[PDB]
Subunit: 459 residues, 4 copies
């Protein structure tokens, strides 16, 4: 059977999509800060609310893909939407509502693409879906590594040779043409995926449901752009969703043994996403303003970084360490506590950066060993949401999304005013946040290690 070839086609279009998205993510925070005139305290909250929307969007799109429309065409619909989003990013305007419209289109497109691509990957292998998903996630990592290394250098190079604006928007065009390369790749190789489909893909398209989801997608783009623009609207929406999550838990508390364990596991999940969201927010600003991009090994100049390419170390270390864990596992929710400790030593790595290297900017090795620890923790604490316990799955998804925004306000603890360009004075606020955050992660380690007898009670 050539089910491997159907898996190759979906892996190719998925690789190019993650190419487009992560080539955009590595630059979006620097884009709001440098090109746009946003102060970092607002760019942190705007990206964080957008990260929450992007994270919880696949739930709606995954249900639309198998119950309302076809999984194949809903994935293609989200791909074309993401094409519109990155093409909206590439027009040279200083308009806030322009980027906000592009970010809302990105939210809807991600939600309609990602879960359906992973859905039919499950469909192809009917249970070695784990074997396919491993190669699937590997193609995702190598594609995001290419983009996160490429699009920031395109930004630097195009701005250097062509002045001021063309850099950022050429990199966003690179994300757009990456989506179009994957769509052209799909238009050529869709024959293998034609056999495996969703429940509605057996039948032709329903234009009622198509017009419904298209008008709702536009209505969802407007809703997401307004949530991003006005920060106070994002706060009330996060608070209302927080009361909703607290409601679902207390409502189910009324029944209820063993769910208190999942409740605890959800509490730690919120703590975890406050740490992991930091590496995209304040750590990016820290790398932008307080890291010497001059990378030299043992006194020899190799290259000079671009502060966005640092985020490419998250996929790299994943591909470096995921085989390490496999063999090391060969030769139990307490592995949360291990991730808490590894996140702690990662923040303490950034606090260490203050000691050894002081010029206003710490060394660049800080980013390497840092992302090593962060990705290591992320490696061994990811997938806990899949092992929960249906109605609670929503509460977990919303809780994780809310924690993306809450981590964004935690990054505001190290927000630098835009009148402070001295890196000698911006280093304290960064190292202070990271040091006390590492203390908070050691606290979380103590919490999970002390609460382990509760977990062993529940088994």
């Amino acid at each position: 059977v050539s089910k491997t070839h159907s898996f190759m086609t979906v892996s190719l279009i998925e690789l190019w999509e993650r190419f487009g998205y992560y080539g955009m993510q590595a630059l979006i925070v620097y884009f709001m800060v440098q090109r746009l005139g946003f102060d970092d305290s607002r760019a942190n909250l705007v990206w964080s609310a957008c990260a929450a929307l992007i994270y919880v969007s696949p739930a709606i799109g995954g249900w639309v893909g198998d119950k309302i429309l076809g999984t194949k065409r809903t994935m293609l619909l989200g791909a074309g939407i993401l094409s519109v989003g990155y093409a909206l990013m590439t027009v040279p305007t200083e308009n806030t509502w322009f980027m906000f419209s592009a970010l809302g289109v990105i939210v809807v497109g991600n939600g309609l693409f990602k879960p359906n691509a992973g859905n039919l990957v499950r469909k192809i292998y009917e249970s070695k879906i784990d074997s396919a998903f491993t190669i699937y996630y590997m193609a995702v990592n190598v594609g995001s590594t290419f983009s996160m290394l490429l699009t920031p250098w395109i930004k630097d190079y195009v701005n250097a040779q062509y002045g001021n604006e063309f850099g950022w928007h050429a990199a966003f065009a690179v994300c757009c043409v990456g989506i179009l390369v994957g769509l052209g790749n799909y238009a050529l190789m869709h024959k293998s995926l034609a056999n495996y489909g969703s429940e509605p893909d057996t039948r032709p398209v329903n234009k009622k449901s198509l017009a419904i989801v298209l008008a709702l997608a536009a209505l969802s783009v407007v809703a997401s752009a307004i949530i991003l623009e006005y920060e106070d609207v994002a706060r009330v929406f996060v608070y209302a969703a927080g009361v909703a999550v607290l409601g679902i838990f207390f409502h189910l508390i009324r029944t209820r043994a063993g769910l208190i364990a999942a409740l605890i596991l959800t509490v730690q999940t919120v703590f975890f996403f406050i740490f992991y969201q930091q590496m995209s927010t304040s750590l990016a600003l820290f790398a932008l303003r307080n890291v010497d991009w001059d990378f030299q090994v043992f006194g020899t100049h190799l290259w000079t970084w671009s502060p966005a390419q640092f985020q490419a170390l998250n996929p790299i270390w994943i591909m470096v360490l995921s085989p390490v864990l496999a063999w090391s596992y060969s030769w139990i929710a307490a592995k949360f506590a291990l991730g808490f400790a590894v996140v702690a030593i990662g923040f303490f790595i950034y606090g260490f950066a203050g000691q050894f290297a002081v010029n206003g900017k710490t060394s660049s090795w800080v980013m390497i060993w840092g992302y090593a620890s962060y990705s290591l923790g992320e490696l061994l604490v990811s997938g806990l949401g899949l092992a929960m316990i249906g109605f609670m799955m929503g509460a977990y998804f919303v809780a994780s999304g809310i924690s993306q925004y809450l981590g964004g306000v935690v990054a505001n603890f190290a927000s630098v005013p835009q009148d402070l360009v001295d890196p000698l004075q911006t280093l304290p606020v960064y190292t202070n946040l990271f040091n006390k955050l590492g203390v908070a992660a050691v606290v979380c380690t103590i919490i999970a290690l002390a609460v382990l007898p509760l977990m062993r009670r529940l088994t």
Copy 2:
């Protein structure tokens, strides 16, 4: 079966009791030194004799709880006695006999409460009593951590805002209201524990035995207060009990193979409690006078300690390391020698403190890594008294109690005269004691490692 809920009620009242006791223990030595005018050489011996009485008191109370009175009501009787004790602590007097009366009431109350709470925990699960006891000890640790972090800060804060006296006595009132919160919690949830009882709890109360134990408790409070007040009385009582222990051993030597192994295991037990008692006595004084409470990680100010809150690191590290040992044990009285070595490296940690940090006061990280080692040793050498071999159980209990006092006189090797306020000059005596104590613990490591062939002979 909801036997879990009966276990939750006893765990709640036990947590609040250990809350009261350890909120009092963390401050009692500093209370005798700072508020009361005791020189440290006397405060060391008075607490050490009180620690001996508190340690061997559960033997009498555990027998009274199942043979004379009801285990439930004897536990409640000890709880009300401990309420009187901490309420006696909270009245603002500089009277020595006031604190001594409170400490004697504490001895009787601990003896009548602790073994009966643990007794009916055994009763509830009739043999997963190990599973219950693990969650039981976990609730004990988290409650003592709260108190040992809270009551010293209450002392600092209330003294800062209200002058001189109210601080210490408010913290002792916090211990008292903690006992009352647990008693109110018991008065509401005693329905679950009503089914499981002792042998006399099947029958109503006997007022003859009640009047006997109440008059004897008062007579025991007077006896304990007099043992504490006059140090020479405590010496003769320890010596007579020492001759008694030596008597029981030689009397049983007359018979007698394999008991010589328990005799050796009792000898090491005496050595061990001389080390572990030190961390409550001289290490507290050392933290009071020669540790910089300014806690900063990598050059960032987090907080400033209170020298009593350092003892909260003993329960913390226990909850941190008891899961570590579990997995590390997955992937034999010689584990005594391991504890000897870990105690040794703990004393050598405090000796190291002299080198790196000298301002008159060593760094505060000394307390962290120290209590890590001490609790680690305590972790892997606790419970050896439960595996002995009945008549010898008394000799082991008395030997361990006597060793609490002997460790108190060992702490007098580093007793500072009260005319020496220069920390530059109080650092030598502390570091010298801790360094030669670490040498003594390495000697004990050599002893147990060399005597292991005797142990293998006995199996």
Copy 3:
């Protein structure tokens, strides 16, 4: 059965052959640089093309030994040819075509000797041939260690006592008399090997095939000497063979699942031989010009090295670490990635050399810990060519041979002009190459670790 004794005789003649060859290899690069007037950029390429010819020569000789002539007499023919080669090396001339003729004779002699000696070692044990081959490779290592320690010291000593020329040519005579000692040893003990033979050894010699291979050997010596002399001829031949390897792969791509895994394993093989060839080329020059041969341990003078004796650390560490791996393996193409990482840390060892020791010349411990890492990697990534998948075996052999030359041009990245005798200025170019090469090996580690899911797909 005394098959052990037949194995001892072939092991003795093999030991003396590797004695001759490695006593010549350790000096050949220094011979082209110091005695001959070659600039290092040419001596690197000439040796590298010769290393490619020597590496792929056993394929032709192994087929001639069992299909055309007798394995015993073809091995003896190659031994006598190698005798002529080293005797050609020992005549004192500054003639380029003299050394080139000697090197071509060495290529033909190695090809006709080595695979047939190993072939009849397989013949003797018909499957404990692994047990014999382990002792076989051990005798090879100890013999090469003797020569690589002896012949460079003979060069130093004879030049010191006898002027200028006699040193290098006496060491090449030592290689020649070493071949003659093994041939005399064979002429005495060939009775044991007379029973075990090849397919033609059952029958007497065919003089047609003998005259064919002798005229072709002379024609092969001329072809090899011309490939070595003119560098541009070596480039075109490597390029044509590269197109041939690319041809074989694409031709077999037309069919073809699982061969893509061997294709990937061939790609890494090319990368690996670019690293391992470096230790014979630039590392030799680095040891010649930027390593303090004064070897002192903890401030005590032991000896002063000769820069060629450093290559004797490759066999030494092999015999030191091959038992280590055996027990460590007791108590999966990803072991390529492990070798990539160990090669990386080996190059970073040489980059470290710049920091600690600067006098123009780094310490000599650099060579020790370096060759430890290089031989460790070589240890755990050797033998992958034997596990391939017949027609592709040629493509793998040619690819590895081509990579020997490509590693030689990579060594030209650190080629020093002959007008630059200041070691203070030759240290940068060496340390810079080794540091960026270590970066390239970390890149290869990331490649193999990320591509591992492809390997697990193929099993």
Copy 4:
């Protein structure tokens, strides 16, 4: 059965004998150097020849104990002889022939005591003789630790309070009274050992054989004293015995497969005893002249050593590490190579001593970590002589004895003239020998690791 009690009586008399012997050994080298006027180059050779005689003496005594006389009475005869020896040591004379007579009496007494005590320990348990021998060796270690800590301090104290002579001779009287305490202990508890005996102990004493062994013992005392006195006589005797060992090997080479493996194992045995003998010879002189006896841990004065008490670290570390190996072995002649490497790092510890501490005298921690490594190697390479292959057992015993003397001449590489009292100038010769000896031990590690395929061939 109370066979344990018979084992306790022999363990008590054995403990007191090793008490006497090691209380004498720790001082004998310093006695020849300090009290007697021997230059160290002669005291090294005299002790080394005496160590050879003491090592090979148990062979004759063990055969006399079970074939000629009774094992019990031959052991008692050797005990009374050793009593005469140490009593001969305790008379205050500067006479060379006095000490030589005492040393010869020690050789005969050790030979007649030690193997028979161990022989009837085998007799008592008829195969848990391993369990008995472990407790047996433990009693030996703890007794030698007491003596090696006691008798050097007796020497220091008695010389300080009583002038000049009484110190050394009081410590030798301590060794004598230690033998007499064990003999008095035996005279009281010999009832248990009366049941278990040798083959002749069934029958009464034979006065012919008694007079034979007594006259031969006196003749052996004269022969040993003359071998010790004139160094050239010791050389010729060692050379003749060396030719004898070489003879036995070549004579057995004439037959002979697998014995070549024991031949190799004997070669390494000679190398090993050259290293281990060093720690009693030059390391003692080094500790006497170039080690600061001031022992302080982390800046606190504990005590000041006596340079002979350093040898008590050999039994201590054995009792510390023999349990370590047991558990570490739970969770193959190549363990020779491991001992070679551990001996190497031990010599490199002493070479390290030159770097950190220079006042003319290195730190005292050098002796601690040194003897840790030496005893560790000794731990895991002892007992290889018991696993040989009868007629060769003699060759192995003589080879090990000869290597004791050869190690004594190796110690003469660091012999200091008696006109050089400056420790600033005696430190180089010691550190130079130890550093190049560590290099020699690394060479031995390479030898055994490279020769391991020969060992695997023989199994």
